[PDB]
Amino acid sequence: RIGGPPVFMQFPPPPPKEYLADGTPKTYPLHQPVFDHGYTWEHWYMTNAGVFHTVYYGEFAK
Amino acid sequence: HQGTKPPRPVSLESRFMNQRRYDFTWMHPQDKFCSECRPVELECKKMCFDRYRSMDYRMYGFQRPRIQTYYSFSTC
Amino acid sequence: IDPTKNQWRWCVDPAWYGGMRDKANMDMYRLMVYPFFGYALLYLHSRFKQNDKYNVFAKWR
Amino acid sequence: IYEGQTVQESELIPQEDDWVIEETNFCLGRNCYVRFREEDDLARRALHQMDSQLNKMHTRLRDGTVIPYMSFHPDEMVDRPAPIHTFSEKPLLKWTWDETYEEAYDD
Amino acid sequence: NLEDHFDLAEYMMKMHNPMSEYLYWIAGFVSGLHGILPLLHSNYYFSGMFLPRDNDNTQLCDDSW
Amino acid sequence: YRHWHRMSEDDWALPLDSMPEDVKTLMATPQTERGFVEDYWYNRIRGEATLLDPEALPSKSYIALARDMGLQIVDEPSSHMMGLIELYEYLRGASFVGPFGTIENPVLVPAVGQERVVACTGGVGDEEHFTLWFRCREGFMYRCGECDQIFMLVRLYYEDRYWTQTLVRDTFMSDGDMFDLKTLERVHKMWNKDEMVRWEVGYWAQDYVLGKGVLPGMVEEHTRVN
Amino acid sequence: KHFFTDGANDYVTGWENTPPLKFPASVMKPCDYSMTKPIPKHWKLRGSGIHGPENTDLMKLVLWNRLKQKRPQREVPNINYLKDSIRLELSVNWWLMSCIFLWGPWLHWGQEYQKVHEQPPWAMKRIDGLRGEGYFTWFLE
Amino acid sequence: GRELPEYVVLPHNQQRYGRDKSYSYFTCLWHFPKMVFTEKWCYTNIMWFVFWTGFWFIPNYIWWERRYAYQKAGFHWEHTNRKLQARKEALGMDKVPASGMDW
Amino acid sequence: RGSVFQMPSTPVYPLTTTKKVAPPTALAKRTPEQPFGWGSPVREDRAWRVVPRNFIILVIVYLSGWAAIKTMLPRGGSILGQIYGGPPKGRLI
Amino acid sequence: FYILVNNNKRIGIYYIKLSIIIGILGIVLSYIIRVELYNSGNRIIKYDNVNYYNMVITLHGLLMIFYIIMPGLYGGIPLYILPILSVITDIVLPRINNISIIIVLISYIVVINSIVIEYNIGTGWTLYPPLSIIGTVIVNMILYGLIIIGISSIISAINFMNILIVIDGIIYVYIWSIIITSVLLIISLPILNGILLMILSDIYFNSIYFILNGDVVLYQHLFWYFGHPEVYILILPAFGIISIILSVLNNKIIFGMKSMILAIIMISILGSIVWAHHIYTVGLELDTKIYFNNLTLIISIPTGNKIYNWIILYIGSYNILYNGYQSLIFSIMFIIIFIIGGITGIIISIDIIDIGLHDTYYIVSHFHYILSIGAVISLLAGILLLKDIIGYYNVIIKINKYFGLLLFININIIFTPQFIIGFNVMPRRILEYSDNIIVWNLISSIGSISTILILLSIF
Numbered sequence A: 001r002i003g004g005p006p007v008f009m010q011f012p013p014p015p016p017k018e019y020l021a022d023g024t025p026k027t028y029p030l031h032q033p034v035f036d037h038g039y040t041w042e043h044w045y046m047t048n049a050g051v052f053h054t055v056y057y058g059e060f061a062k
Numbered sequence B: 001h002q003g004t005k006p007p008r009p010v011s012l013e014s015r016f017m018n019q020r021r022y023d024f025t026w027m028h029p030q031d032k033f034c035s036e037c038r039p040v041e042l043e044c045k046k047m048c049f050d051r052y053r054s055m056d057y058r059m060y061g062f063q064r065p066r067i068q069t070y071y072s073f074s075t076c
Numbered sequence C: 001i002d003p004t005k006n007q008w009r010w011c012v013d014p015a016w017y018g019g020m021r022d023k024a025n026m027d028m029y030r031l032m033v034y035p036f037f038g039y040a041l042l043y044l045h046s047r048f049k050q051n052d053k054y055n056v057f058a059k060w061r
Numbered sequence D: 001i002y003e004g005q006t007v008q009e010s011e012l013i014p015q016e017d018d019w020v021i022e023e024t025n026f027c028l029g030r031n032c033y034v035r036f037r038e039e040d041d042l043a044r045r046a047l048h049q050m051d052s053q054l055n056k057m058h059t060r061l062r063d064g065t066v067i068p069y070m071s072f073h074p075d076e077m078v079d080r081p082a083p084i085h086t087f088s089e090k091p092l093l094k095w096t097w098d099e100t101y102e103e104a105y106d107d
Numbered sequence E: 001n002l003e004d005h006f007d008l009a010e011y012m013m014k015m016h017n018p019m020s021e022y023l024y025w026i027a028g029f030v031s032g033l034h035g036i037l038p039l040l041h042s043n044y045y046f047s048g049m050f051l052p053r054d055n056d057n058t059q060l061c062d063d064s065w
Numbered sequence F: 001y002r003h004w005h006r007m008s009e010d011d012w013a014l015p016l017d018s019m020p021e022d023v024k025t026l027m028a029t030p031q032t033e034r035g036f037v038e039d040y041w042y043n044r045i046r047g048e049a050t051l052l053d054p055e056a057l058p059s060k061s062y063i064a065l066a067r068d069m070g071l072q073i074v075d076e077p078s079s080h081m082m083g084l085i086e087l088y089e090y091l092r093g094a095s096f097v098g099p100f101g102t103i104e105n106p107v108l109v110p111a112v113g114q115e116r117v118v119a120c121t122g123g124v125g126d127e128e129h130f131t132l133w134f135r136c137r138e139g140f141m142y143r144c145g146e147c148d149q150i151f152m153l154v155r156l157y158y159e160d161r162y163w164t165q166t167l168v169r170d171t172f173m174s175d176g177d178m179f180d181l182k183t184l185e186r187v188h189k190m191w192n193k194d195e196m197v198r199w200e201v202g203y204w205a206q207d208y209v210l211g212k213g214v215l216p217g218m219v220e221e222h223t224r225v226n
Numbered sequence G: 001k002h003f004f005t006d007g008a009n010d011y012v013t014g015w016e017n018t019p020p021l022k023f024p025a026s027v028m029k030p031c032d033y034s035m036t037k038p039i040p041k042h043w044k045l046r047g048s049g050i051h052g053p054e055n056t057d058l059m060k061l062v063l064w065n066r067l068k069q070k071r072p073q074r075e076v077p078n079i080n081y082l083k084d085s086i087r088l089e090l091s092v093n094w095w096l097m098s099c100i101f102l103w104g105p106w107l108h109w110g111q112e113y114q115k116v117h118e119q120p121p122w123a124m125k126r127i128d129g130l131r132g133e134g135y136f137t138w139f140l141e
Numbered sequence H: 001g002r003e004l005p006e007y008v009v010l011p012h013n014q015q016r017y018g019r020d021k022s023y024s025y026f027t028c029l030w031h032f033p034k035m036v037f038t039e040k041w042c043y044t045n046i047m048w049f050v051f052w053t054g055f056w057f058i059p060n061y062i063w064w065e066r067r068y069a070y071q072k073a074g075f076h077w078e079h080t081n082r083k084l085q086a087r088k089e090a091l092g093m094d095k096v097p098a099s100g101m102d103w
Numbered sequence I: 001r002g003s004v005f006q007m008p009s010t011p012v013y014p015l016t017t018t019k020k021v022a023p024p025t026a027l028a029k030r031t032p033e034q035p036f037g038w039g040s041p042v043r044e045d046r047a048w049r050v051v052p053r054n055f056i057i058l059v060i061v062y063l064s065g066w067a068a069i070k071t072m073l074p075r076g077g078s079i080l081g082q083i084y085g086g087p088p089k090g091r092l093i
Numbered sequence J: 001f002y003i004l005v006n007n008n009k010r011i012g013i014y015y016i017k018l019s020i021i022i023g024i025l026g027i028v029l030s031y032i033i034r035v036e037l038y039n040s041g042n043r044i045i046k047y048d049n050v051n052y053y054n055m056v057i058t059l060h061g062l063l064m065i066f067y068i069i070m071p072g073l074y075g076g077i078p079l080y081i082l083p084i085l086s087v088i089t090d091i092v093l094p095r096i097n098n099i100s101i102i103i104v105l106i107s108y109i110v111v112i113n114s115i116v117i118e119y120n121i122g123t124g125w126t127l128y129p130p131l132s133i134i135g136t137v138i139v140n141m142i143l144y145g146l147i148i149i150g151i152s153s154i155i156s157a158i159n160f161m162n163i164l165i166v167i168d169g170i171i172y173v174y175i176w177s178i179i180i181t182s183v184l185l186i187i188s189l190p191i192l193n194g195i196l197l198m199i200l201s202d203i204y205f206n207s208i209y210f211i212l213n214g215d216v217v218l219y220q221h222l223f224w225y226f227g228h229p230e231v232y233i234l235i236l237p238a239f240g241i242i243s244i245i246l247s248v249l250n251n252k253i254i255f256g257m258k259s260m261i262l263a264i265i266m267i268s269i270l271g272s273i274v275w276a277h278h279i280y281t282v283g284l285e286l287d288t289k290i291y292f293n294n295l296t297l298i299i300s301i302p303t304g305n306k307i308y309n310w311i312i313l314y315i316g317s318y319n320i321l322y323n324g325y326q327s328l329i330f331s332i333m334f335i336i337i338f339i340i341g342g343i344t345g346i347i348i349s350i351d352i353i354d355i356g357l358h359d360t361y362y363i364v365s366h367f368h369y370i371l372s373i374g375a376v377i378s379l380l381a382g383i384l385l386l387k388d389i390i391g392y393y394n395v396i397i398k399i400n401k402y403f404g405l406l407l408f409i410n411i412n413i414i415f416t417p418q419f420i421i422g423f424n425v426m427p428r429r430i431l432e433y434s435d436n437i438i439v440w441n442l443i444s445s446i447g448s449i450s451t452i453l454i455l456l457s458i459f
């Protein structure tokens, strides 16, 4: 139907990036903390990635 | 036929007849008119309205003779 | 008649096809939110009082 | 019941005596929580998430064809996390039959 | 827009304000109080004590405390 | 198609009130610059002007006749694009069943975007397996991991646009000799005389060319109450 | 028929799986290529091969289902169809007639008999001294 | 049609936001109350909600309290009866006409 | 005019018999200031003024009448009670 | 917006979020019970306030069933993935979907408000008259909640049934489970509404259906005619989730798909005609008891087929894949736990055995193993499977073997003793008990306090 809701639209470009006065890129809130402690273990698990593939999923102590 | 329905014998209150746990107030939760009368017990309400009128509280209905009103279907 | 000039059908939700009228109707009900809260809160107070729940401490004093 | 595709003996004959089953790794790699950059704003983190989709990954075989990420159900086919509007174009469920019509061919 | 592609984009992109989570936990905490507060209120109303002493409704030894 | 609703009245013809009032400029506008309503009336005015001139039809070639009516001559490029459009439209509300896909003849998966979700159900009979869904992205020859069926994505894309009936017409149709308003007037007088109007589109069109409300009864025709 | 069914009683869109029997097979035919003879090996696949509008019969079915929606005159159905369309209406009307002219007379007769004899004419008279009409539907006693 | 630059340099030089600092299990016990009592948008919303909820609670409260006291005093016809009895005592008459009617 | 499927049996256009001046909308064209509606004469929008006015009047009458009944007339179970619910004239209570 | 959203996936999240919030109150109520039952004599509830305990058990049962598990399994997961499992974009009736979640919340607020404002008394979650109709206004408030909840359930059932019209793919086993559950609601809910209205009539309209010459057993028939289909409505969506998890995480096609689908259909048909095994002790006719007992046992046949089909899904799966994922462990745990609950259900199906075990804690343990462990674990397993799609974080549950082991050990400690207590015997819905049942009740109480502590570890 002409004029109906398009079945596909391209994303518009993202808004301009922001830099501080000194030139440092501006950071935004990020809820991925780097916990402080002495543990450094890394556990890996072969995970189902569909029916024919897997992925080696790693969990890091930090 | 309904306008001149013959009177029927007064029901004898049998073993399981006329059982009440609480007064009839679901029609008037706050006003509680005719708490003792049943929702469509006209004769009970008439005498109850008369008490309220005798207490200086107006109530509508049951005052005009049936044969002196229109649409009664009770005229000779 | 031009098919491309009716895009408001899918660009705007049907509940607001009416422009300011639909928005005004939505806005009017929004004004009643706090009046409703006070009204609802009063009912809780009414039941709480009628059940003598305010006299919990005075009952045993 | 399904027991795999039927195979004829002639289909198993190799064209060389040194042929062995290809040793291509179907482990897509090492992954973890998607790690965003503090410098990226909301829009650019969305691009980052869209570039970490396992269901957009595949394994390329020796003949150039790719075996993609596949799932029994279409729940694993939308972007993770699920976007507001998922199936803009209707997913196609491909059925196979032996019927054919002449218009499709040319002599 | 790219920001609108994902539902709850701020949370999924890990930028949401933490207050949203606090309210959710607070709402759950308030729901739990609906079982404890009326218990205390009802106990006091009918007994004059917020909570009983264990086995206080039964005969107790002289030295029981 | 089965998933379309009932034909509207406009699906057959448009009301004359939708005719552009500046007919002189309408007949001089290039096809790429005409909107849906403008293009409809350009073809109807020019198409009916040639059809309502019987004495000239036998000497007019099919190429010229098709041009006057606004019909596009079919060629392999245009036919290919239109065919894939209809296949895409049909698959919106119809099942997707066809021959088993191979490297020589991959299963064609039409799409507008760069990606479309597809399921493989294997072959026929015992060869049919459980649905295996995958994301068919452009530029890769996909191979089912179970039955080895080959899939390929076909994109309906052209010069920053996706294939549409109007896009195909604009790309391939070439505007011919500019429409001559003398033909409109000549045919108008042929079928419209002494209060009899058997060629009404031309009667309105001629009135607009002369301004508006010049011909008999047109002022009363254009006066409305609401 | 009242109820809408996609397969048979599809009056919302008017879609029909097959064309009318009026058309010669050369003009239009039902979309059935199950009997197509085996394709010669030297023939090459040009089209998709996918079931759809590339097949002539399906294209003509889609075209006709859209262009049939405007017709100069009505396509008059036979009386059998017209009867079926209002079967419930006609039967309810006859049911009303039966109530007026069959049920009414004997129900009136029973009440008149009941007046004189204290019980309906289709009931055994009682000897137990209880007063009143008694039952009405005798066979449910 | 709008033209935008690839990047913009902000006037200030403060890095206000970034990765969240490492926290413990009970970090919420002090951070949450800090936000309520220290963030403008937090306690402004709380005060706004409390003020208007209470604002509309008063008129409803006043109306119900008068109604509740009236109901406890008796039914509607009991209130009129007391006035009727008071009127009889005032005039000393055993029987008097009903309200809105003359002798 | 209406639908395109309704037409006269004989297609005839009347030769103007009067000399009345053409209404402005009969000769109007699309203009930048009026992209739509140039073919229809301008009309007053009464609904914008009458609806709120009528609604206010009805509400005022509705509320005022309700208040008057509950104040001027004696106490009664219902509005009909307060009007006709009194005892018969001459019946002392 | 937050309340105006019609997106089905958003609404699915709201159902899960709301169930957790209401779950806290349900857990609190459950915790109050086991603390009181730690030993003979009052512990946290005064003897003069025994009415409160009756309210605690009544709300614990009601909230957990209608406000926690049913929204979680029938409203939460289905609204998120069902339109995705179908090839369609969104739910058929978007506006109805929005109002359904709002209705659930309002009914919850009404229920909890009634706790605070009304006098606290209880009549059990089954609301048997005449006790239910001689109570205070809190019973009236609870009825309004149930009726309001009934509206949301039926409209949500209508929403799912419409998927058959628009589904553009294959009807997977999970889709069948939701569809058949909707069918059960459509046929059972109107019966529930009718009898609930009669309860209101006696409470509020001076009706006399539940006084002498009016059979009180009439209520039990109509209630349980909905009551048992309800338990099957709760579990059937759980069966659908297990089928998806086992097939997906083992890379094995679901074996006997049609047998699974027919088993679900068979269970619903049988589940609609076996309600009277809840009424064995009332004194039904001999032939009536034999019929219901015989048909009740038959429900095990289709239920058994599903169990075995699940087992073969896990058997033979590749060893290289890590099997310690919480979703996989929960799915496997469900088979082990459900068998325990179902077998005990067959034991109490024999009416003569039921004579001794009716209204005892053996029945409690029976439905806790199925619901408190099985249904919860199935809901947990499904949410874990969809963690990437849903996108929640800030929890440690995906790979946490401690949580799975501790949960399994401690829940079994709570409810295994309750089977033993059933033969001892301890009645249900009881606050005090004889001194010689303390040991088993004490062990279960220690289990309850332990489970609550474990929940704090996920954060």
Ligand SMILES: CCCCCCCCCCCCCCCCCC(=O)OC[C@H](COP(=O)([O-])OCC(O)COP(=O)([O-])OC[C@@H](COC(=O)CCCCCCCCCCCCCCCCC)OC(=O)CCCCCCCCCCCCCCCCC)OC(=O)CCCCCCCCCCCCCCCCC
Binding pocket: C044, E008, E010, E011, E016, E017, E019, E020, E021, E022, E023, E024, E025, E026, E027, E028, E029, E030, H036, H041, H042, H043, H045, H046, J002, J013, J016, J017, J020, J021, J023, J024, J116, J383, J390, J391, J392, J393, J394, J395, J455, J458, J459
């Ligand atoms: C069963 C338990 C165990 C479960 C284990 C298994 C779990 C498995 C995982 C399950 C996961 C499911 C899927 C999750 C998907 C999540 C998606 C998501 O995050 O969506 C984004 C969504 C919103 O994010 P967003 O997009 O940024 O939204 C922006 C806003 O829309 C706009 O921003 P804004 O700032 O403008 O916001 C407006 C804000 C404005 O904010 C403010 O102004 C805040 C001001 C500060 C107020 C703070 C509270 C103050 C309280 C004071 C109390 C005083 C008491 C005094 C007592 C005195 C006694 C003497 O709020 C309002 O204006 C309205 C607030 C109304 C709601 C809150 C109501 C609170 C309770 C009220 C109670 C009233 C009681 C009255 C009773 C009276 C009876 C008569 O996130 C949330 O809403 C938070 C979700 C958090 C959980 C996420 C899941 C994590 C995994 C689970 C963790 C475990 C949870 C356990 C349960 C809780 C335990 C307690």
Ligand SMILES: CCCCCCCCCCCCCCCCCC(=O)OC[C@H](COP(=O)([O-])OCC(O)COP(=O)([O-])OC[C@@H](COC(=O)CCCCCCCCCCCCCCCCC)OC(=O)CCCCCCCCCCCCCCCCC)OC(=O)CCCCCCCCCCCCCCCCC
Binding pocket: G001, G002, G003, G004, G088, J187, J269
């Ligand atoms: C003794 C003297 C006193 C006698 C008193 C009698 C009292 C009777 C009370 C009845 C009350 C009124 C109900 C009907 C009102 C509408 C009447 C009307 O318009 O009729 C003319 C009109 C005639 O239609 P037409 O298209 O013009 O037909 C033209 C020709 O007649 C030729 O048409 P055609 O043959 O070519 O076929 C076209 C038409 C043909 O259909 C009709 O015309 C229907 C006519 C029905 C009339 C009523 C007769 C009584 C039906 C009894 C059914 C009992 C069910 C089993 C109960 C088991 C209990 C243990 O198809 C439809 O219209 C399809 C309608 C949709 C059907 C949906 C059915 C859903 C339920 C399926 C069964 C569920 C259980 C499965 C169990 C097995 C599991 C493995 O009927 C309709 O269009 C009505 C359709 C819309 C209303 C359907 C209501 C379905 C209710 C389903 C309840 C399921 C409950 C399941 C659980 C129960 C146990 C817990």
Ligand SMILES: CCCCCCCCCCCCCCCCCC(=O)OC[C@H](COP(=O)([O-])OCC(O)COP(=O)([O-])OC[C@@H](COC(=O)CCCCCCCCCCCCCCCCC)OC(=O)CCCCCCCCCCCCCCCCC)OC(=O)CCCCCCCCCCCCCCCCC
Binding pocket: G086, G087, G088, G089, G091, G092, G095
């Ligand atoms: C020496 C000694 C000698 C002794 C000699 C003794 C002699 C004894 C003689 C005994 C004779 C016995 C004869 C037995 C053999 C009978 C053979 C026969 O013909 O059978 C078939 C014959 C007719 O069946 P058929 O051939 O299938 O009918 C052909 C149709 O045309 C089929 O065509 P169709 O299907 O197209 O039909 C039209 C159909 C087409 O359908 C449609 O258009 C499609 C839609 C259908 C579904 C409709 C859904 C609902 C519609 C909504 C609209 C409702 C409107 C009304 C609303 C009312 C509101 C209040 O639509 C309708 O019919 C239905 C709509 C019409 C209105 C419905 C009204 C409500 C009906 C339900 C309630 C009925 C109870 C009412 C009770 C009163 C009021 C409370 O059956 C009977 O007549 C029954 C047999 C009765 C046997 C009684 C035996 C006991 C009595 C003995 C009396 C004599 C004893 C005297 C003493 C003797 C002592 C010695």
Ligand SMILES: CCCCCCCCCCCCCCCCCC(=O)OC[C@H](COP(=O)([O-])OCC(O)COP(=O)([O-])OC[C@@H](COC(=O)CCCCCCCCCCCCCCCCC)OC(=O)CCCCCCCCCCCCCCCCC)OC(=O)CCCCCCCCCCCCCCCCC
Binding pocket: C032, C035, C036, C039, H056, H059, H060, H063, I056, I059, I061, I062, I063, I064, I065, I066, I067, I069, I077, I078, I079
């Ligand atoms: C010759 C030609 C002659 C022509 C003559 C023409 C005469 C025309 C006369 C016209 C005037 C009529 C006046 C009477 C009208 C009826 C009024 C009435 O009483 O209605 C209720 C009446 C019973 O009331 P009642 O016992 O009389 O009054 C007792 C008092 O209310 C005692 O008070 P209470 O304290 O017991 O009541 C509790 C209180 C409870 O109060 C509370 O709870 C609140 C208290 C504190 C509030 C303070 C503020 C704080 C914030 C509050 C926020 C609230 C909202 C929160 C959110 C929601 C939750 C609440 O309730 C209320 O306040 C009641 C009203 C509540 C508001 C309802 C909405 C009304 C809106 C109306 C206007 C529309 C909107 C305007 C907007 C304007 C914008 C510019 O019920 C019925 O009428 C039942 C029968 C159904 C209708 C029958 C119609 C028959 C028509 C007959 C036609 C005859 C034709 C003859 C033709 C002959 C041809 C020959």
Ligand code: HEA
Binding pocket: J126, J231, J232, J234, J235, J277, J278, J279, J280, J296, J299, J300, J301, J303, J304, J307, J338, J339, J340, J341, J342, J343, J345, J346, J347, J348, J349, J350, J354, J358, J359, J363, J366, J367, J370, J371, J375
């Ligand atoms: C999800 C909840 C749920 C589920 C699935 C079930 C399932 C079953 N329930 Fe349950 N039941 C409840 C919830 C549930 N129940 C509740 C809440 C109560 C108490 C209500 C109240 O009183 O308040 C209750 C009460 C209850 C009673 C007692 C009612 C009373 O008198 O108070 C009985 C009696 O037979 C019973 C039976 C069954 C049976 C036979 C099944 C069957 O579906 C189980 C079948 C499963 C198996 C048998 C195991 C799997 C099969 C195999 C391993 C192989 C085949 C096995 C055999 C042939 C034995 N239930």
Ligand code: HEA
Binding pocket: J016, J019, J020, J023, J027, J030, J031, J033, J034, J057, J058, J060, J061, J062, J064, J065, J068, J069, J072, J124, J125, J126, J364, J368, J371, J372, J376, J379, J380, J411, J414, J428, J429, J430, J431, J448, J451, J452
């Ligand atoms: C879904 C229903 C459900 C659930 C989860 C539970 C959970 C629990 N119940 Fe039960 N219970 C009932 C339904 C439920 N119950 C019913 C219907 C009755 C009969 C009512 C009556 O007598 O009338 C009953 C009765 C009942 C009694 C008998 C009361 C009496 O007769 O005196 C007791 C006693 O200890 C008890 C204890 C518990 C305990 C200790 C838990 C839990 O603590 C067990 C372990 C669980 C946890 C530690 C919490 C885990 C988290 C969740 C369950 C929420 C998850 C939410 C999401 C995933 C969204 N329950």
Ligand SMILES: CCCCCCCC/C=C\CCCCCCCC(=O)OC[C@H](COP(=O)(O)OCCN)OC(=O)CCCCCCC/C=C/CCCCCCCC
Binding pocket: B026, B038, B039, B040, B041, B042, J205
């Ligand atoms: C402009 C005004 C127009 C008014 C007229 C047109 C509109 C009419 C609208 C439909 C009216 C339908 C009324 C239905 C209720 C009828 C009540 C009734 O008749 O009940 C009595 C009848 C028989 O009783 P008896 O008197 O003993 O019979 C003896 C015979 N002499 O049955 C009963 O008693 C049962 C009563 C059931 C009433 C159910 C109606 C709903 C009431 C809900 C109240 C809830 C209040 C609590 C707060 C919540 C508020 C939603």
Ligand SMILES: CCCCCCCC/C=C\CCCCCCCC(=O)O[C@H](COC(=O)CCCCCCC/C=C/CCCCCCCC)COP(=O)(O)OCCN
Binding pocket: J221, J269, J272, J273, J284, J285, J288, J291
């Ligand atoms: C136009 C559509 C019309 C549809 C109408 C549908 C009507 C039925 C709807 C469901 C309600 C069923 C009626 C309720 C039956 C209750 C009977 C009962 O409780 O009786 C038992 C006895 O009942 C039995 O023996 C049990 C029989 C089971 C009846 C089940 C009927 C309803 C089944 C619906 C299941 C779903 C539909 C299945 C369809 C087919 C599936 C293949 C009590 O016995 P005692 O107390 O001992 O008294 C005996 C004498 N003193």
Ligand SMILES: [O-][O-]
Binding pocket: J227, J228, J231
């Ligand atoms: O209920 O089992």
Ligand SMILES: [Cu+2]
Binding pocket: J227, J228, J231, J275, J277, J278
């Ligand atoms: Cu049961």
Ligand SMILES: [K+]
Binding pocket: J036, J037, J038, J039, J040, J041, J042, J043, J431, J432, J433
């Ligand atoms: K105790």
Ligand SMILES: [Zn+2]
Binding pocket: F120, F121, F122, F129, F132, F144, F145, F146, F147, F148, F149
């Ligand atoms: Zn395949």
